[PDB]
């Protein structure tokens, strides 16, 4: 059938970013050779080569949901894909507490509400599995001291 395209933002050093932006504007095949993206099996890390120079990169999760919109006439906009991940080239480090826009900054601790992580439920399932493995399970309560 059809597989939805997956889009992730890429963040690069400003000197490196300026060279890449000029190459993108040129549209030359040299840009394809200059920039290569490698994805780790874990997928929480990436290796990016800029101008054939390897840079350590870690994937981070954008707090806000960002949608790419394409409009032929500039009056009608059609959503193409949803971006929730950014790869940065130079857990709480796998999370980004800051929005891409300058206004939205420290969103997690400002323009966001306290939300449940679910994770915790999976940990409870592991405890239930250990109870099943154990021949006998005993429950007791300890008061805070």
């Amino acid at each position: 059938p059809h597989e939805l395209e997956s889009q992730f933002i890429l963040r690069l050093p400003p000197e490196y970013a300026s060279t890449v932006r000029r190459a993108v504007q040129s549209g030359h095949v040299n840009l394809k050779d200059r920039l290569t993206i490698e994805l780790h099996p874990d997928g929480r890390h990436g290796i990016v080569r800029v101008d054939r120079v390897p840079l350590a990169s870690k994937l981070v999760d954008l707090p806000c949901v960002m949608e790419s919109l394409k409009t032929i006439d500039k009056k009608t906009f059609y959503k193409t894909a949803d971006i929730c991940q950014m790869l940065v080239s130079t857990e709480k480090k796998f999370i980004w507490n800051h929005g891409i826009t300058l206004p939205l900054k420290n969103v997690r601790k400002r323009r966001f509400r306290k939300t449940a992580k679910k994770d915790v439920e999976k940990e409870v399932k592991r405890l239930l599995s250990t109870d099943a493995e154990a021949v006998s399970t005993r429950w007791e309560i300890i008061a805070e001291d």
Binding site: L102, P103, L128, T137, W139, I141, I142
Partner: protein, 82 residues
């Protein structure tokens, strides 16, 4: 003690003030600098048979409230089912 006119006026002014504030904060290009009720923990004792002949007993303590609440709810539901 106007109940409708006073209430409507306050609702309209508060909404407009919030709308102006929300627009200003989002439109701003200014950079921003980076910045249980019981109080009782849960302890579980598990008895298992090891390889050959052994009956080791393991005591595990959970100090995380969310995990404790989820575990207790499942245990109570299991008791309710039987």
């Amino acid at each position: 003690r106007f109940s409708v006119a006073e209430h409507q006026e306050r609702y309209k002014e508060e909404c407009q003030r919030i709308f102006d504030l929300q627009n200003k904060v989002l439109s701003s290009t200014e950079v921003l600098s980076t910045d249980s009720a019981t109080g009782r923990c849960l302890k579980i004792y598990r008895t298992f048979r090891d390889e050959e002949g052994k009956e080791y007993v393991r005591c595990e303590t959970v100090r995380k409230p969310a995990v404790i609440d989820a575990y207790v709810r499942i245990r109570t539901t299991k008791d309710e089912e039987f």
